[PDB]
A = this chain, B = another copy of it.
């Protein structure tokens, strides 16, 4: 069939952002980090603008729109890179002009963190994750981000369903051959959350280094 909510997310999808790594600065630890920070920083801006285009999101209270975003942001970044990395082997595509393999990830000291990010890539590869599912899953993570101080819980739950129902209907139509594909998709979020938390902690930890 055609699904209203996925087609909107498809056109809501942001445009390619580039890391523009400074060629004047000599290859190093700080560099990789200075670039990813500025990259993430620039990504967030269009992620917020993106969030408004999610059906139902903009009818939430500003307090809740924030809470969901204050919770989810890293998850949305990480799923981002995970997706761009699907057709690659043991490499991560933070942007087209910044691709990290084992030995670069050694220099930045992100081996453990990127290896985690690759566990997520490794999984979605198996499933043949498709863009229609990527976008719908980003949305779901934002909505299911388990924030502690939601004002309107019902409104946020209803948003969760609308997105869930979208995934469900999509999979019912495009993947009848696996009646549990949708569930399988939702079962990959706990890793995304796990990995999200590490990244955050890792980020705040290195604000002393």
Q: Is the CB of B28 within 8 A of A66?
A: yes
> Is there a chain B Cβ closer than 8 Å to A67's Cβ?
yes
Known contacts A149-B107, A193-B194; is-contact A183 B186 (Cβ 8 Å):
yes
A:1-34 near B, CB below 8 Å: 26-29
Chain B nearest CB from A63 CB (Å) reads 4
Which of B126, B183, B193 lies in contact with A168, CB distance below 8 A? B183
Compute how far the CA of A168 lies from the CA of B197 in the bound complex, rounded to whole angstroms: 29
Q: Is the CB of A61 within 8 A of B26?
A: yes
Q: Is the CB of A187 within 8 A of B160?
A: yes
A:95-146 near B, CB below 8 Å: 106-107, 111, 115-116, 119, 126, 140, 144, 146
**What residues of B have a CB within 8 angstroms of the CB of A111 in the complex?**
111
Compute how far the CA of A28 lies from the CA of B168 in the bound complex, rounded to whole angstroms: 34
Of chain B, the residue at the smallest CB distance from A25 is B62
**What residues of B have a CB within 8 angstroms of the CB of A149 in the complex?**
28-29, 106-107
Q: Is the CB of B148 within 8 A of A115?
A: yes
Q: Is the CB of B144 within 8 A of A190?
A: yes
Which of B26, B115, B140, B183 lies in contact with A182, CB distance below 8 A? B183
16 new A-B pairs (CB below 8 Å) besides A168-B179, A186-B189? A26-B61, A28-B66, A144-B190, A146-B190, A160-B184, A167-B183, A168-B180, A168-B183, A182-B183, A187-B189, A189-B190, A190-B190, A190-B192, A190-B193, A194-B194, A207-B209
